[PDB]
Amino acid sequence: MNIFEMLRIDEGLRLKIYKDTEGYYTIGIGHLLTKSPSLNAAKSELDKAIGRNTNGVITKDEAEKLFNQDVDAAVRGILRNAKLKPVYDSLDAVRRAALINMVFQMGETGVAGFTNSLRMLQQKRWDEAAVNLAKSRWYNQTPNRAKRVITTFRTGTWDAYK
Ligand SMILES: [Cl-]
Ligand SMILES: [Cl-]
């Protein structure tokens, strides 16, 4: 297992524009297109991302390319964030993938706001972070996925994904 496989499991893969769990237009492997409620707007952003007139539909290769860019962007985000980088740097490889998962889903900003949880992960108080991580809208809205990522931080193994 790795970060790519991990996210592919959590996000799925859809080749036509669809709405995510929040009702926002997305395509591929969890690539958010826009928070706007306009399909046209989403189509415009899709064509801009791909470089062609897609008519709201992409190929598998194209989805994977977006996915690679998004993963990449998520790591750099972390590395560039003052709150995140130290945590990330203190963790083992497995747990780092869980932190990337969160940032891909919620953005750097939203994750950087889990202050208490961040501090517990940094301190290696696994069970404690896991309880504090569950006290969140994230957990209440997407409990199964949140469960898998939390288990990941708690155990440092890929057990939740196997
Ligand atoms: Cl893009
Ligand atoms: Cl879920």
CSV table of N, CA and C and ligand atoms in Angstrom, one decimal:
chain,number,residue,atom,x,y,z
A,1,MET,N,0.8,-1.2,0.0
A,1,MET,CA,0.0,0.0,0.0
A,1,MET,C,0.8,1.3,0.0
A,2,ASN,N,0.3,2.3,-0.5
A,2,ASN,CA,0.9,3.6,-0.5
A,2,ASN,C,-0.2,4.7,-0.6
A,3,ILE,N,0.3,6.0,-0.6
A,3,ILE,CA,-0.6,7.2,-0.6
A,3,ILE,C,-1.5,7.2,-1.8
A,4,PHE,N,-1.0,6.8,-3.0
A,4,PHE,CA,-1.9,6.7,-4.2
A,4,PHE,C,-2.9,5.7,-4.1
A,5,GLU,N,-2.5,4.5,-3.6
A,5,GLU,CA,-3.5,3.4,-3.5
A,5,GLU,C,-4.6,3.8,-2.5
A,6,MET,N,-4.0,4.4,-1.5
A,6,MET,CA,-4.9,4.8,-0.3
A,6,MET,C,-6.0,5.7,-0.8
A,7,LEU,N,-5.5,6.8,-1.4
A,7,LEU,CA,-6.5,7.8,-1.9
A,7,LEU,C,-7.5,7.2,-3.0
A,8,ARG,N,-6.9,6.3,-3.8
A,8,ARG,CA,-7.8,5.8,-4.9
A,8,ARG,C,-8.9,5.0,-4.2
A,9,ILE,N,-8.7,4.4,-3.1
A,9,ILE,CA,-9.7,3.6,-2.4
A,9,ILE,C,-10.7,4.6,-1.8
A,10,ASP,N,-10.2,5.6,-1.1
A,10,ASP,CA,-11.1,6.5,-0.5
A,10,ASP,C,-12.0,7.4,-1.4
A,11,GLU,N,-11.4,7.8,-2.6
A,11,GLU,CA,-12.0,8.8,-3.4
A,11,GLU,C,-12.8,8.2,-4.6
A,12,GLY,N,-12.4,7.0,-5.0
A,12,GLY,CA,-13.0,6.3,-6.2
A,12,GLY,C,-12.5,6.8,-7.4
A,13,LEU,N,-13.1,6.5,-8.6
A,13,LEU,CA,-12.6,7.0,-9.8
A,13,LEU,C,-13.8,7.2,-10.7
A,14,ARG,N,-14.1,8.4,-11.1
A,14,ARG,CA,-15.3,8.6,-12.0
A,14,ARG,C,-14.8,9.5,-13.1
A,15,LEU,N,-15.2,9.1,-14.3
A,15,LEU,CA,-14.8,9.8,-15.6
A,15,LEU,C,-15.7,10.9,-16.0
A,16,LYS,N,-16.9,11.0,-15.5
A,16,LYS,CA,-17.8,12.1,-15.8
A,16,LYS,C,-18.0,13.0,-14.6
A,17,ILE,N,-18.3,14.3,-14.8
A,17,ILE,CA,-18.4,15.2,-13.7
A,17,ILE,C,-19.5,14.7,-12.7
A,18,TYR,N,-19.2,14.7,-11.4
A,18,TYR,CA,-20.1,14.2,-10.4
A,18,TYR,C,-20.1,15.2,-9.2
A,19,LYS,N,-21.1,15.0,-8.3
A,19,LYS,CA,-21.0,15.9,-7.1
A,19,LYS,C,-20.4,15.0,-6.0
A,20,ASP,N,-19.6,15.7,-5.2
A,20,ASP,CA,-18.9,15.0,-4.1
A,20,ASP,C,-19.9,14.9,-2.9
A,21,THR,N,-19.3,14.4,-1.8
A,21,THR,CA,-20.1,14.3,-0.6
A,21,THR,C,-20.7,15.6,-0.1
A,22,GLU,N,-20.1,16.8,-0.4
A,22,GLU,CA,-20.6,18.1,-0.1
A,22,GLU,C,-21.6,18.7,-1.1
A,23,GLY,N,-21.8,18.0,-2.2
A,23,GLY,CA,-22.6,18.5,-3.3
A,23,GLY,C,-21.8,19.3,-4.3
A,24,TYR,N,-20.4,19.3,-4.2
A,24,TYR,CA,-19.6,20.1,-5.1
A,24,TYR,C,-19.2,19.3,-6.4
A,25,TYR,N,-19.1,20.0,-7.6
A,25,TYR,CA,-18.7,19.4,-8.8
A,25,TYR,C,-17.2,18.9,-8.8
A,26,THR,N,-17.0,17.6,-9.1
A,26,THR,CA,-15.7,16.9,-9.0
A,26,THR,C,-15.6,16.0,-10.2
A,27,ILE,N,-14.4,15.5,-10.6
A,27,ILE,CA,-14.3,14.5,-11.6
A,27,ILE,C,-13.0,13.7,-11.2
A,28,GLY,N,-12.8,12.5,-11.8
A,28,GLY,CA,-11.7,11.7,-11.6
A,28,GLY,C,-11.6,11.0,-10.2
A,29,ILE,N,-10.4,11.2,-9.7
A,29,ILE,CA,-10.0,10.7,-8.3
A,29,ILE,C,-10.1,11.8,-7.3
A,30,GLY,N,-11.3,12.3,-7.1
A,30,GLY,CA,-11.6,13.3,-6.1
A,30,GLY,C,-11.0,14.7,-6.4
A,31,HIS,N,-11.0,15.0,-7.8
A,31,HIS,CA,-10.5,16.3,-8.1
A,31,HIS,C,-11.6,17.3,-8.1
A,32,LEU,N,-11.7,18.2,-7.1
A,32,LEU,CA,-12.7,19.2,-7.0
A,32,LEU,C,-12.6,20.2,-8.1
A,33,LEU,N,-13.7,20.4,-8.7
A,33,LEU,CA,-13.6,21.4,-9.8
A,33,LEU,C,-13.9,22.8,-9.4
A,34,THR,N,-15.0,22.9,-8.6
A,34,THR,CA,-15.5,24.2,-8.2
A,34,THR,C,-16.5,24.1,-7.1
A,35,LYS,N,-16.6,25.1,-6.2
A,35,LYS,CA,-17.6,25.1,-5.2
A,35,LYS,C,-18.9,25.8,-5.7
A,36,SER,N,-18.8,26.3,-7.0
A,36,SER,CA,-20.0,26.9,-7.5
A,36,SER,C,-21.1,25.9,-8.0
A,37,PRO,N,-22.3,26.4,-7.8
A,37,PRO,CA,-23.4,25.5,-8.2
A,37,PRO,C,-23.8,25.6,-9.6
A,38,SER,N,-22.9,26.0,-10.4
A,38,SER,CA,-23.1,26.1,-11.9
A,38,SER,C,-22.4,24.9,-12.6
A,39,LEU,N,-23.1,24.1,-13.4
A,39,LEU,CA,-22.5,23.0,-14.1
A,39,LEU,C,-21.6,23.5,-15.2
A,40,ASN,N,-22.0,24.6,-15.7
A,40,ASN,CA,-21.2,25.3,-16.8
A,40,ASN,C,-19.9,25.8,-16.3
A,41,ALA,N,-19.9,26.3,-15.1
A,41,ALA,CA,-18.7,26.8,-14.4
A,41,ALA,C,-17.8,25.6,-14.2
A,42,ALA,N,-18.4,24.5,-13.8
A,42,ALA,CA,-17.6,23.3,-13.5
A,42,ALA,C,-16.9,22.8,-14.8
A,43,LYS,N,-17.7,22.8,-15.9
A,43,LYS,CA,-17.3,22.4,-17.2
A,43,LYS,C,-16.1,23.3,-17.7
A,44,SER,N,-16.3,24.6,-17.5
A,44,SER,CA,-15.2,25.5,-17.8
A,44,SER,C,-13.9,25.2,-17.0
A,45,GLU,N,-14.0,25.1,-15.7
A,45,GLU,CA,-12.9,24.7,-14.9
A,45,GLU,C,-12.3,23.4,-15.4
A,46,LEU,N,-13.2,22.4,-15.9
A,46,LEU,CA,-12.6,21.1,-16.3
A,46,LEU,C,-11.7,21.3,-17.6
A,47,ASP,N,-12.2,22.0,-18.5
A,47,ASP,CA,-11.6,22.2,-19.7
A,47,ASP,C,-10.2,22.8,-19.6
A,48,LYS,N,-10.2,23.8,-18.6
A,48,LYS,CA,-9.0,24.6,-18.3
A,48,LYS,C,-8.0,23.7,-17.6
A,49,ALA,N,-8.4,22.8,-16.7
A,49,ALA,CA,-7.5,21.8,-16.1
A,49,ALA,C,-6.8,20.8,-17.0
A,50,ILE,N,-7.6,20.3,-18.0
A,50,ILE,CA,-7.2,19.3,-19.0
A,50,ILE,C,-6.5,19.8,-20.2
A,51,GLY,N,-6.9,21.0,-20.6
A,51,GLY,CA,-6.4,21.6,-21.8
A,51,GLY,C,-7.1,21.3,-23.1
A,52,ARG,N,-8.4,21.0,-23.0
A,52,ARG,CA,-9.1,20.6,-24.2
A,52,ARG,C,-10.6,20.8,-23.9
A,53,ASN,N,-11.4,20.6,-24.9
A,53,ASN,CA,-12.8,20.8,-24.8
A,53,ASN,C,-13.3,19.4,-24.4
A,54,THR,N,-13.6,19.2,-23.1
A,54,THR,CA,-13.9,17.8,-22.7
A,54,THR,C,-15.4,17.5,-22.8
A,55,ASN,N,-16.2,18.5,-22.7
A,55,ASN,CA,-17.6,18.2,-22.7
A,55,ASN,C,-17.9,17.4,-21.4
A,56,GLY,N,-17.3,17.7,-20.3
A,56,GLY,CA,-17.5,17.0,-18.9
A,56,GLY,C,-17.1,15.6,-18.8
A,57,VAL,N,-16.4,15.1,-19.7
A,57,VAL,CA,-16.0,13.7,-19.7
A,57,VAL,C,-14.5,13.6,-19.9
A,58,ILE,N,-13.7,12.8,-19.1
A,58,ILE,CA,-12.3,12.6,-19.3
A,58,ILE,C,-11.9,11.1,-19.4
A,59,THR,N,-10.6,10.9,-19.8
A,59,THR,CA,-10.2,9.6,-19.9
A,59,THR,C,-9.5,9.2,-18.6
A,60,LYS,N,-9.3,7.9,-18.4
A,60,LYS,CA,-8.6,7.3,-17.3
A,60,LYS,C,-7.2,7.9,-17.1
A,61,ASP,N,-6.4,8.0,-18.2
A,61,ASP,CA,-5.1,8.7,-18.2
A,61,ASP,C,-5.2,10.1,-17.6
A,62,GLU,N,-6.2,10.8,-18.2
A,62,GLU,CA,-6.4,12.2,-17.8
A,62,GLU,C,-6.7,12.3,-16.3
A,63,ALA,N,-7.6,11.4,-15.8
A,63,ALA,CA,-7.9,11.4,-14.3
A,63,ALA,C,-6.6,11.2,-13.5
A,64,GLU,N,-5.8,10.2,-13.9
A,64,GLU,CA,-4.6,9.9,-13.2
A,64,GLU,C,-3.6,11.1,-13.2
A,65,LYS,N,-3.6,11.8,-14.3
A,65,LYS,CA,-2.7,12.9,-14.3
A,65,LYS,C,-3.1,14.0,-13.3
A,66,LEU,N,-4.4,14.2,-13.3
A,66,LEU,CA,-4.9,15.2,-12.3
A,66,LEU,C,-4.6,14.8,-10.9
A,67,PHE,N,-4.8,13.4,-10.7
A,67,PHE,CA,-4.5,12.8,-9.4
A,67,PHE,C,-3.0,13.0,-9.0
A,68,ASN,N,-2.1,12.6,-9.9
A,68,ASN,CA,-0.7,12.9,-9.6
A,68,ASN,C,-0.4,14.3,-9.2
A,69,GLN,N,-1.0,15.3,-9.9
A,69,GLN,CA,-0.8,16.7,-9.6
A,69,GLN,C,-1.4,17.0,-8.3
A,70,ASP,N,-2.5,16.4,-8.0
A,70,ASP,CA,-3.2,16.8,-6.7
A,70,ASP,C,-2.4,16.2,-5.5
A,71,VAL,N,-1.9,15.0,-5.6
A,71,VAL,CA,-1.1,14.4,-4.5
A,71,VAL,C,0.1,15.3,-4.3
A,72,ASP,N,0.7,15.6,-5.4
A,72,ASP,CA,1.9,16.4,-5.3
A,72,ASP,C,1.7,17.8,-4.6
A,73,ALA,N,0.6,18.4,-5.0
A,73,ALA,CA,0.2,19.6,-4.5
A,73,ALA,C,-0.1,19.5,-3.0
A,74,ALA,N,-0.7,18.4,-2.6
A,74,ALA,CA,-1.0,18.2,-1.2
A,74,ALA,C,0.4,18.2,-0.3
A,75,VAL,N,1.4,17.5,-0.8
A,75,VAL,CA,2.6,17.4,-0.1
A,75,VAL,C,3.3,18.7,0.1
A,76,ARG,N,3.3,19.4,-1.1
A,76,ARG,CA,4.0,20.7,-1.1
A,76,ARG,C,3.3,21.6,-0.1
A,77,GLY,N,1.9,21.5,-0.1
A,77,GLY,CA,1.1,22.3,0.8
A,77,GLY,C,1.6,22.1,2.2
A,78,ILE,N,1.7,20.8,2.6
A,78,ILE,CA,2.1,20.5,3.9
A,78,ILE,C,3.5,21.1,4.2
A,79,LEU,N,4.4,20.9,3.3
A,79,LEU,CA,5.7,21.3,3.5
A,79,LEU,C,5.8,22.8,3.6
A,80,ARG,N,4.9,23.4,2.9
A,80,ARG,CA,5.0,24.9,3.0
A,80,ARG,C,4.2,25.5,4.1
A,81,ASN,N,3.5,24.7,4.9
A,81,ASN,CA,2.7,25.2,6.0
A,81,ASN,C,3.5,25.0,7.4
A,82,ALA,N,3.6,26.2,8.0
A,82,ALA,CA,4.3,26.2,9.3
A,82,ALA,C,3.7,25.3,10.4
A,83,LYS,N,2.4,25.1,10.3
A,83,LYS,CA,1.8,24.3,11.3
A,83,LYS,C,1.9,22.8,11.0
A,84,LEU,N,1.9,22.6,9.8
A,84,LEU,CA,1.9,21.2,9.3
A,84,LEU,C,3.2,20.5,9.2
A,85,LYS,N,4.2,21.2,8.6
A,85,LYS,CA,5.4,20.7,8.3
A,85,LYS,C,6.1,20.0,9.5
A,86,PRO,N,6.1,20.6,10.7
A,86,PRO,CA,6.8,20.0,11.8
A,86,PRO,C,6.1,18.7,12.2
A,87,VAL,N,4.8,18.6,12.0
A,87,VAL,CA,4.2,17.4,12.3
A,87,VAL,C,4.6,16.3,11.4
A,88,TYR,N,4.4,16.7,10.1
A,88,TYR,CA,4.7,15.8,9.1
A,88,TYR,C,6.1,15.2,9.2
A,89,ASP,N,7.0,16.1,9.5
A,89,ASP,CA,8.4,15.7,9.6
A,89,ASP,C,8.6,14.7,10.8
A,90,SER,N,7.9,14.9,11.8
A,90,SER,CA,8.1,14.0,13.0
A,90,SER,C,7.5,12.6,12.9
A,91,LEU,N,6.6,12.4,11.9
A,91,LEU,CA,5.9,11.1,11.7
A,91,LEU,C,6.7,10.1,10.8
A,92,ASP,N,6.3,8.8,11.0
A,92,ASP,CA,6.8,7.7,10.2
A,92,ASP,C,6.0,7.8,8.9
A,93,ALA,N,6.5,6.9,7.9
A,93,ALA,CA,5.9,7.0,6.6
A,93,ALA,C,4.4,6.7,6.4
A,94,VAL,N,4.0,5.7,7.2
A,94,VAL,CA,2.6,5.4,7.1
A,94,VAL,C,1.7,6.5,7.6
A,95,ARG,N,2.1,7.1,8.7
A,95,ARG,CA,1.3,8.1,9.3
A,95,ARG,C,1.3,9.4,8.5
A,96,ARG,N,2.5,9.6,7.8
A,96,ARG,CA,2.6,10.7,6.9
A,96,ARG,C,1.5,10.6,5.8
A,97,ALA,N,1.2,9.4,5.3
A,97,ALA,CA,0.2,9.2,4.3
A,97,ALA,C,-1.2,9.5,4.8
A,98,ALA,N,-1.4,9.2,6.1
A,98,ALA,CA,-2.7,9.6,6.6
A,98,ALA,C,-2.8,11.1,6.7
A,99,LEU,N,-1.8,11.8,7.0
A,99,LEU,CA,-1.9,13.3,7.1
A,99,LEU,C,-2.1,13.9,5.7
A,100,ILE,N,-1.4,13.2,4.7
A,100,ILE,CA,-1.6,13.7,3.3
A,100,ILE,C,-3.1,13.5,2.9
A,101,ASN,N,-3.7,12.3,3.3
A,101,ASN,CA,-5.1,12.0,3.0
A,101,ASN,C,-5.9,13.1,3.4
A,102,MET,N,-5.8,13.5,4.7
A,102,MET,CA,-6.6,14.6,5.3
A,102,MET,C,-6.6,15.9,4.5
A,103,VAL,N,-5.3,16.3,4.2
A,103,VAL,CA,-5.1,17.6,3.4
A,103,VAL,C,-5.7,17.5,2.0
A,104,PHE,N,-5.5,16.4,1.3
A,104,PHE,CA,-6.2,16.2,0.0
A,104,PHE,C,-7.7,16.4,0.1
A,105,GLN,N,-8.3,15.8,1.1
A,105,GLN,CA,-9.7,15.9,1.3
A,105,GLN,C,-10.2,17.3,1.7
A,106,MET,N,-9.6,17.9,2.8
A,106,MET,CA,-10.0,19.1,3.4
A,106,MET,C,-9.2,20.4,3.2
A,107,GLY,N,-8.0,20.3,2.6
A,107,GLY,CA,-7.2,21.4,2.4
A,107,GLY,C,-6.4,21.6,3.6
A,108,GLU,N,-5.3,22.2,3.3
A,108,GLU,CA,-4.2,22.6,4.2
A,108,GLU,C,-4.7,23.4,5.4
A,109,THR,N,-5.5,24.4,5.0
A,109,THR,CA,-6.1,25.3,5.9
A,109,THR,C,-7.0,24.5,6.9
A,110,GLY,N,-7.9,23.7,6.4
A,110,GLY,CA,-8.8,23.0,7.3
A,110,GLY,C,-8.0,22.1,8.2
A,111,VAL,N,-7.0,21.4,7.7
A,111,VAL,CA,-6.3,20.5,8.6
A,111,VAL,C,-5.4,21.3,9.6
A,112,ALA,N,-4.8,22.4,9.1
A,112,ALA,CA,-4.0,23.2,10.0
A,112,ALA,C,-4.8,23.7,11.3
A,113,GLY,N,-6.1,23.7,11.1
A,113,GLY,CA,-6.9,24.0,12.3
A,113,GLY,C,-7.2,22.9,13.3
A,114,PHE,N,-6.6,21.7,13.1
A,114,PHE,CA,-6.8,20.6,14.1
A,114,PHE,C,-5.7,20.7,15.0
A,115,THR,N,-5.5,21.9,15.6
A,115,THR,CA,-4.4,22.1,16.5
A,115,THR,C,-4.1,21.2,17.6
A,116,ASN,N,-5.1,20.8,18.4
A,116,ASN,CA,-4.9,19.9,19.5
A,116,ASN,C,-4.5,18.5,19.0
A,117,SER,N,-5.1,18.0,17.9
A,117,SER,CA,-4.8,16.7,17.3
A,117,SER,C,-3.4,16.7,16.8
A,118,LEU,N,-3.1,17.8,16.1
A,118,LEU,CA,-1.7,18.0,15.6
A,118,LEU,C,-0.6,17.8,16.7
A,119,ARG,N,-0.9,18.5,17.7
A,119,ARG,CA,0.1,18.4,18.9
A,119,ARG,C,0.1,17.0,19.4
A,120,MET,N,-1.0,16.3,19.6
A,120,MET,CA,-0.9,15.0,20.1
A,120,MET,C,-0.2,14.1,19.1
A,121,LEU,N,-0.4,14.3,17.8
A,121,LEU,CA,0.3,13.4,16.8
A,121,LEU,C,1.9,13.6,17.0
A,122,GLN,N,2.2,14.9,17.1
A,122,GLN,CA,3.6,15.3,17.2
A,122,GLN,C,4.2,14.6,18.4
A,123,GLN,N,3.4,14.6,19.5
A,123,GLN,CA,3.9,14.0,20.8
A,123,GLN,C,3.8,12.4,20.8
A,124,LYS,N,3.2,11.8,19.7
A,124,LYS,CA,3.1,10.4,19.6
A,124,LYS,C,2.2,9.7,20.6
A,125,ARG,N,1.1,10.5,21.0
A,125,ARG,CA,0.0,10.1,21.9
A,125,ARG,C,-1.2,9.7,20.9
A,126,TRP,N,-0.9,8.5,20.3
A,126,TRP,CA,-1.8,7.9,19.3
A,126,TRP,C,-3.2,7.7,19.7
A,127,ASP,N,-3.5,7.1,20.8
A,127,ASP,CA,-4.9,6.9,21.1
A,127,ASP,C,-5.6,8.2,21.5
A,128,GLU,N,-4.9,9.1,22.1
A,128,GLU,CA,-5.4,10.4,22.4
A,128,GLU,C,-5.8,11.2,21.2
A,129,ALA,N,-4.9,11.1,20.2
A,129,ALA,CA,-5.1,11.9,19.0
A,129,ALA,C,-6.3,11.4,18.3
A,130,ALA,N,-6.4,10.1,18.3
A,130,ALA,CA,-7.5,9.4,17.7
A,130,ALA,C,-8.8,9.8,18.3
A,131,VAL,N,-8.9,9.8,19.6
A,131,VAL,CA,-10.2,10.3,20.2
A,131,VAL,C,-10.5,11.8,19.8
A,132,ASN,N,-9.5,12.7,19.9
A,132,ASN,CA,-9.7,14.1,19.6
A,132,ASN,C,-10.0,14.2,18.1
A,133,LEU,N,-9.4,13.4,17.2
A,133,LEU,CA,-9.7,13.5,15.8
A,133,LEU,C,-11.1,13.2,15.5
A,134,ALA,N,-11.8,12.4,16.2
A,134,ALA,CA,-13.2,12.0,16.0
A,134,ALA,C,-14.2,13.0,16.4
A,135,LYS,N,-13.8,14.0,17.2
A,135,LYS,CA,-14.6,15.1,17.6
A,135,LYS,C,-14.6,16.2,16.6
A,136,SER,N,-15.2,15.9,15.5
A,136,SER,CA,-15.1,16.9,14.4
A,136,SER,C,-16.2,16.7,13.4
A,137,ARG,N,-16.4,17.7,12.7
A,137,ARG,CA,-17.5,17.6,11.7
A,137,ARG,C,-17.1,16.6,10.6
A,138,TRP,N,-15.7,16.6,10.3
A,138,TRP,CA,-15.2,15.6,9.3
A,138,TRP,C,-15.6,14.2,9.6
A,139,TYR,N,-15.4,13.8,10.9
A,139,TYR,CA,-15.8,12.5,11.3
A,139,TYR,C,-17.2,12.2,11.3
A,140,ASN,N,-18.0,13.2,11.7
A,140,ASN,CA,-19.5,13.1,11.7
A,140,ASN,C,-20.1,13.1,10.2
A,141,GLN,N,-19.5,13.8,9.3
A,141,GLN,CA,-20.0,13.8,8.0
A,141,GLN,C,-19.4,12.6,7.2
A,142,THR,N,-18.2,12.2,7.3
A,142,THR,CA,-17.7,11.0,6.5
A,142,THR,C,-17.0,10.1,7.5
A,143,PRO,N,-17.8,9.4,8.3
A,143,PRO,CA,-17.3,8.5,9.3
A,143,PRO,C,-16.5,7.3,8.8
A,144,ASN,N,-17.0,6.6,7.8
A,144,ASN,CA,-16.2,5.4,7.4
A,144,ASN,C,-14.8,5.8,6.9
A,145,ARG,N,-14.7,6.8,6.2
A,145,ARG,CA,-13.4,7.2,5.7
A,145,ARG,C,-12.5,7.8,6.8
A,146,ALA,N,-13.2,8.6,7.6
A,146,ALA,CA,-12.5,9.2,8.8
A,146,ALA,C,-12.0,8.1,9.7
A,147,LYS,N,-12.8,7.0,9.8
A,147,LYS,CA,-12.4,5.9,10.6
A,147,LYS,C,-11.1,5.3,10.0
A,148,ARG,N,-11.1,5.1,8.7
A,148,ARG,CA,-9.9,4.5,8.2
A,148,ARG,C,-8.7,5.3,8.4
A,149,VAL,N,-8.8,6.6,8.3
A,149,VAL,CA,-7.6,7.5,8.4
A,149,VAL,C,-7.2,7.5,9.9
A,150,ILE,N,-8.2,7.7,10.7
A,150,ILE,CA,-7.8,7.7,12.2
A,150,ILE,C,-7.1,6.4,12.6
A,151,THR,N,-7.6,5.2,12.1
A,151,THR,CA,-7.0,3.9,12.5
A,151,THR,C,-5.5,3.9,12.1
A,152,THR,N,-5.3,4.6,11.0
A,152,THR,CA,-4.0,4.7,10.4
A,152,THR,C,-3.0,5.5,11.3
A,153,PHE,N,-3.5,6.6,11.8
A,153,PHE,CA,-2.7,7.4,12.7
A,153,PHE,C,-2.5,6.6,14.0
A,154,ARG,N,-3.6,5.9,14.5
A,154,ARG,CA,-3.5,5.2,15.7
A,154,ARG,C,-2.5,4.0,15.7
A,155,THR,N,-2.5,3.2,14.6
A,155,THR,CA,-1.7,2.1,14.5
A,155,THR,C,-0.4,2.1,13.8
A,156,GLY,N,-0.4,3.1,12.9
A,156,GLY,CA,0.8,3.2,12.1
A,156,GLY,C,0.9,2.0,11.1
A,157,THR,N,-0.2,1.3,10.8
A,157,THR,CA,-0.2,0.1,9.8
A,157,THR,C,-1.2,0.4,8.8
A,158,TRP,N,-1.3,-0.4,7.7
A,158,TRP,CA,-2.3,-0.2,6.7
A,158,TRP,C,-3.5,-1.1,7.0
A,159,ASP,N,-3.6,-1.6,8.2
A,159,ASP,CA,-4.7,-2.5,8.5
A,159,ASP,C,-6.1,-2.1,8.1
A,160,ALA,N,-6.4,-0.8,8.1
A,160,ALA,CA,-7.8,-0.3,7.8
A,160,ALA,C,-8.0,-0.4,6.3
A,161,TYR,N,-6.9,-0.5,5.5
A,161,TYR,CA,-7.1,-0.5,4.1
A,161,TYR,C,-6.9,-1.9,3.5
A,162,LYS,N,-6.6,-2.9,4.3
A,162,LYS,CA,-6.4,-4.2,3.9
A,162,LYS,C,-7.7,-5.0,4.2
B,1,CL,CL,-5.6,21.8,-12.2
B,2,CL,CL,-17.0,8.1,4.6
